[PDB]
Design a protein around this nucleic acid. Structure first.
Length: 856
DNA sequence: GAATCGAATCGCCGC
RNA sequence: UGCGGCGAU
DNA sequence: TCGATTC
């Protein structure tokens, strides 16, 4: 009800603490320490204000139980509330005579659903409604019970298979009134089908719903002292009323928890001094001893964090500290452009002036609904980034703290970060620059082509395109408001950043000091690393690991391969056959035609398949997508947009075309990048064998317990995959749903993507130290796959990122090391089932050193 | 045994 | 946590 | 689609 302010005592400590300020003052002076400590104090100030506004909004709408302050109270209160209503059913069943009015209504709804509905709606009514009378909350409890009881039968019994297609539609709706209206509409559709047994819901009378809530309030009172009954003006027939008041101890508990969480959640901001070097697991980045300390590894469990303190990983610690030491400054020229065009447009780039029908309208209506949500959500991120950029514009340099996830990929801790979108990327440039030279001017021009989308074309033609458009680049840099050409580009704000630096080198020559980040980005990091482990030549050429005559587009290679299958199937494909299909819920037997491969090939060739049909399928391969996942993708990305546009008349039956295309893509990717498919299968089966508990069916006892997966990456970072699932969970249709065993499915679903993401993090970290020590590189722009530095350092970072990969996979076979970790953990019965290590190919790693288009 | 289900990480915003 | 949306890879 | 979990 009334939250304590953590700021008065706790937040003042981080500014006035004796030891953090001196350690900051000895490195960078006392006056920079005062500004930094006040900035970190403001970071905690803003985060507490964020929690308070959210809490007050949840107080108004009755969403207090959704807040994390009320969760520990409900978690202990719920087991006694569920038992009290279960016992009361047993007492009434033993009781003779008339059953109570509420007894019949309580049985149909789930009893655990009663316990949360009562607790949530009581606290919603006590906190917000301003009426403490028993009947108003009791009517609210009964109406909430009836709403779950009336529409729960759709989820529970008659449509438990039909719900899975309306569940996603229900989840897309936001707000209980919006969720209810669709639930009424779906009930009318289901009752027309006769699916619910043809029994329409009989609406509870208003007097009946109060009797439901009153008994539930009393049953909560016997279970817990959440509310105490009060009777006012008793004996007066006109003024007799009964009220319930929330427990002062329980309201104190939520406020104490709310004040604690308000100090735990800060809004992280860039550092005005270089960040504190990561000496250990905690305390790195920001200097002050605070309530929320930064962790080297972002772990969901504190036990997983504690595994990192014993291990000695010197190279991991250096690479983060070098990345933190990179100084950034806000590019003022792009900021001056961005400040004026953002006031005129929600997104400055979204519109530039240049030279089954009902279901189609329903999907069109859902398109303008999500776009309205999208355009609001996109803007509120932009306003925060612009304010952060405008705040630190005048500072000579800012620094970003760096930590990393449990896999090993590094991220910037601050909310404003170089790892953001195009505008945020363009608003940030490196602080320490060097004279550009001929090599840097060449690489600056190459970076200008990449921001323009000329990345698919080899290096000499990328240089030519910049020189052809030289007069347009100078005109855009001369006045970005007068010429909109830079906005039309793929990466507009970063392209405009290149235009300013391109114009400076024309005015000031090759002696110009350029501090612009020059990003080299690997084409497909997961497949590059997978092709490197198993030395697959055709995969490495597809991901530009090998030197090539031109930049090789893996989407185009697959699109060419599926095109070859399409033309062959158009001549020798299967003819169409009629197939019986039965809808199980209806029981209806119908005879539909099945399109053969010959007919399906003719449809797709009439559409014309390009890299765009195959593009998303290739990207999601490293995440674990296969033929089934591709079927949904080609439908939503190519077929469904076609039929809204008037195309797709060829796709007479869209799902058959999707399954046909998914098979063709999966056959093509499996033969294009062989190592990627085999390596992910080896990792998935290894995790599956380690996940599963081993028992003989006649002995019952488990010979081997469910085991987690652990491996160590080449630069010394250990990573533990322990996906764990809760035993029980609660779900309500109209209300928010409210040690532990290893979830085997998540262990298999995540082993291969996280392993290759651990490899790219080690590659990024090894690249940072190699470029820092073998070469003179001190400024780094790191976004997982992208490696960026100043133009004068751009040539060496180009060499360094290749040298680290060729050294890493020559030194270690990470898959073979992985097999050494879990082989002793494996049960002897699983040993015969375990696949052998995938065969090593013909690719030579030294060719990566001379590959122009790897970029990484 | 039949029944039935699934189909990467990190942040921000909202419910 | 989950759900919805956005972005990064 | 299919090898799973999952009852």
């Amino acid at each position: 009800m009334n939250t304590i302010n953590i700021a008065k005592n706790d937040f003042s400590d981080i500014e006035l603490a004796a030891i953090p300020f001196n350690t900051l003052a000895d490195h960078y002076g006392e006056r920079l320490a005062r500004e930094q400590l006040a900035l970190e104090h403001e970071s905690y100030e803003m985060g507490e204000a964020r929690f308070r506004k959210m809490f007050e909004r949840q107080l108004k709408a009755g969403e207090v139980a959704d807040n994390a302050a009320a969760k520990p109270l409900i978690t202990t209160l719920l087991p006694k509330m569920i038992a009290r209503i279960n016992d009361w059913f047993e007492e009434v069943k033993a009781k003779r005579g008339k059953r109570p009015t509420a007894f019949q209504f309580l049985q149909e709804i789930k009893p655990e659903a009663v316990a949360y509905i009562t607790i949530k709606t009581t606290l919603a009514c006590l906190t917000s409604a301003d009426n403490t009378t028993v009947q108003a909350v009791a009517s609210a409890i009964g109406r909430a019970i009836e709403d779950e009881a009336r529409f729960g039968r759709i989820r529970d019994l008659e449509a438990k298979h039909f719900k899975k297609n309306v569940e996603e539609q229900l989840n897309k709706r936001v707000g209980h009134v919006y969720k209810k209206a669709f639930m009424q509409v779906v009930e009318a559709d289901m009752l027309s089908k006769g699916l619910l047994g043809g029994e329409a819901w009989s609406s509870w009378h208003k007097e009946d719903s109060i009797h439901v809530g009153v008994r539930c309030i009393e049953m909560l009172i016997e279970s817990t002292g959440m509310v105490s009954l009060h009777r006012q003006n008793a004996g007066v027939v006109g003024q007799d009323s009964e009220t319930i008041e929330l427990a002062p101890e329980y309201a104190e508990a939520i406020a104490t928890r709310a004040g604690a969480l308000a100090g735990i959640s800060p809004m992280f901001q860039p550092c005005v001094v270089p960040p504190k070097p990561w000496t250990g697991i905690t305390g790195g980045g920001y200097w002050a001893n605070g309530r929320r300390p930064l962790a080297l590894v972002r772990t969901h469990s504190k036990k997983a964090l504690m595994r990192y303190e014993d291990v000695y990983m010197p190279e991991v610690y250096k690479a983060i500290n070098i990345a933190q030491n990179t100084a950034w400054k806000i590019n003022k020229k792009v900021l001056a452009v961005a400040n004026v065009i953002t006031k005129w447009k929600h997104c400055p780039v979204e519109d530039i002036p240049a030279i089954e029908a009902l279901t189609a309208w329903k999907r069109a209506a859902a398109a303008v609904y999500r776009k309205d949500k999208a355009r609001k959500s996109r803007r509120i991120s932009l306003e925060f980034m612009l304010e952060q950029a405008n705040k630190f514009a005048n500072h000579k340099a800012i620094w970003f703290p760096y930590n990393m996830d449990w896999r090993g990929r590094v991220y910037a801790v601050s909310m404003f970060n170089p790892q953001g979108n195009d505008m945020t990327k363009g608003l940030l440039t490196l602080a320490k620059g060097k004279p550009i030279g001929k090599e840097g001017y060449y690489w600056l021009k190459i970076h200008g082509a990449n921001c323009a989308g000329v990345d698919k074309v080899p290096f000499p033609e990328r240089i030519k395109f910049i020189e052809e458009n030289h007069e347009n680049i100078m005109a855009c840099a001369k006045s970005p408001l007068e010429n909109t050409w830079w906005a039309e580009q793929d990466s507009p704000f970063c392209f405009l950043a290149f235009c300013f630096e391109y114009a400076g080198v024309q005015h000031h020559g090759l002696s110009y000091n350029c501090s612009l980040p020059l990003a080299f980005d690997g084409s497909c990091s997961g497949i590059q690393h997978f092709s490197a482990m198993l030395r697959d030549e055709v995969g490495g050429r597809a991901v530009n690991l090998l030197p090539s005559e031109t930049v090789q587009d893996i989407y185009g290679i697959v699109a060419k391969k599926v095109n070859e299958i399409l033309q062959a199937d158009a001549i020798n494909g299967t003819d169409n056959e009629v197939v019986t299909v039965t809808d199980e819920n209806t029981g209806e037997i119908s005879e539909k035609v099945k399109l053969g491969t010959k007919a399906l090939a003719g449809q797709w060739l009439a559409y014309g398949v390009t890299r765009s049909v195959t593009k998303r399928s290739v990207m999601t391969l490293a995440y674990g997508s296969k033929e089934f996942g591709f079927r949904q993708q080609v439908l939503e990305d190519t077929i469904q947009p076609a039929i809204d546009s008037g195309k797709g008349l060829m796709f007479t039956q869209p799902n058959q075309a999707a399954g046909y295309m998914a098979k063709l893509i999966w056959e093509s990717v499996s033969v294009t990048v062989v190592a990627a498919v085999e390596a992910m299968n080896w990792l998935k089966s290894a995790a599956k064998l380690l996940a599963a508990e081993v028992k003989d069916k006649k002995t019952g006892e488990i010979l081997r317990k469910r085991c987690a997966v652990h491996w160590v990456t080449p630069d010394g970072f250990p990573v533990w995959q322990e996906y764990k699932k809760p035993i029980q969970t609660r779900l309500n249709l109209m209300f928010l749903g409210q040690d532990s065993e290893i979830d085997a499915h998540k262990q298999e679903s995540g082993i291969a993507p996280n392993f290759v993401h651990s490899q790219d993090g080690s590659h990024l970290r090894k690249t940072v130290v190699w470029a820092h020590e073998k070469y003179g590189i001190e400024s780094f722009a790191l976004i997982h796959d992208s490696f960026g530095t100043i133009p004068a350092d751009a040539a060496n970072l180009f060499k360094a990122v290749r040298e680290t990969m060729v050294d890493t996979y020559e030194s270690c076979d990470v898959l073979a090391d992985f097999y050494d970790q879990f082989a002793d953990q494996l049960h002897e019965s699983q040993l015969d089932k375990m696949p052998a290590l995938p065969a090593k190919g013909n690719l030579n790693l030294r060719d990566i050193l001379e590959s122009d288009f790897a970029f990484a």
